[PDB]
């Protein structure tokens, strides 16, 4: 299905900005299995950039595999140009960070991804920053998926959490992200500040 993101700036420190609470949580519901782990999502665009907040309920943090998909961490998957091909084309972008914010790219230029994160109680939250290649303008389409790896105090991950895709294979498969449309763009946005 689709979200629809409006058009907005935030700051990139792990705070969540006045601006943030003008817009919905998006809440990814497809689990690979039960869990006490839960997450929520908020997106934003600006002219040169995708805004990921997410904040993940999670009482035991773990990073100790050094597989990255097996560290507590979310995902964020992007396809800019639209195509929904059944594999990975050359604007297609998989990223990834942890709770202590350590950031993997499995596709795409990771000078692209910016992040901080904050250590919530019972949880953390990523603050996550996109670059676009293309302009965006209101009415573009672009392919997405977030995703939660939920680790356990055995180092491993033992639970998936996606907003899009249920069959695990968004990781190879662009076309089965969902969609972001992005609105809300003022066509004029000039006139003086008034004091
Ligand atoms: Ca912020
Ligand atoms: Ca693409
Ligand atoms: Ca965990």
Same mark, same amino acid.
């Given at each position: 299905?689709?979200?629809?993101?409006?058009? +907005?700036?935030?700051? %990139?420190?792990?705070?969540?900005?006045?601006?943030?609470?003008?817009?919905?949580?998006?809440?990814?519901?497809? #689990?690979?299995?039960?869990?006490?782990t839960n997450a929520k999502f908020k997106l934003?665009?600006?002219?040169?950039?995708?805004?990921?907040?997410?904040?993940? #309920?999670?009482?035991?943090?773990?990073?100790?595999?050094?597989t990255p998909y097996q560290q507590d961490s979310?995902?964020?998957?992007?396809?800019?140009?639209?195509?929904?091909?059944?594999?990975?084309?050359?604007?297609?972008?998989? #990223?990834?960070?942890?709770?202590?914010?350590?950031?993997?790219?499995?596709?795409?230029?990771?000078?692209?991804?910016?992040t901080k994160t904050k250590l919530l109680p019972? +949880?953390?939250?990523?603050?996550?920053?996109?670059?676009?290649?293309?302009?965006?303008?209101?009415?573009? %389409?672009? +392919?997405?998926?977030?995703?939660?790896?939920?680790?356990?105090?055995?180092?491993?991950?033992?639970?998936?959490?996606?907003?899009?895709?249920?069959?695990?294979?968004?990781?190879?498969?662009?076309?089965?992200?969902?969609?972001?449309?992005?609105? +809300?763009?003022?066509?004029?946005?000039?006139?003086? %500040?008034?004091?």
């Amino acid at each position: 299905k689709r979200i629809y993101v409006s058009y +907005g700036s935030p700051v %990139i420190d792990g705070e969540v900005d006045d601006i943030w609470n003008n817009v919905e949580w998006n809440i990814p519901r497809i #689990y690979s299995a039960t869990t006490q782990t839960n997450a929520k999502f908020k997106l934003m665009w600006d002219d040169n950039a995708l805004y990921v907040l997410a904040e993940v #309920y999670d009482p035991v943090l773990n990073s100790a595999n050094s597989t990255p998909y097996q560290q507590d961490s979310v995902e964020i998957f992007l396809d800019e140009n639209f195509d929904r091909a059944i594999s990975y084309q050359s604007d297609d972008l998989h #990223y990834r960070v942890n709770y202590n914010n350590f950031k993997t790219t499995d596709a795409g230029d990771i000078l692209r991804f910016y992040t901080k994160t904050k250590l919530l109680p019972d +949880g953390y939250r990523v603050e996550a920053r996109i670059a676009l290649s293309k302009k965006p303008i209101n009415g573009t %389409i672009m +392919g997405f998926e977030f995703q939660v790896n939920e680790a356990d105090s055995s180092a491993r991950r033992v639970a998936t959490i996606n907003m899009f895709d249920n069959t695990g294979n968004a990781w190879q498969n662009p076309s089965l992200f969902g969609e972001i449309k992005l609105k +809300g763009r003022s066509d004029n946005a000039v006139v003086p %500040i008034n004091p």
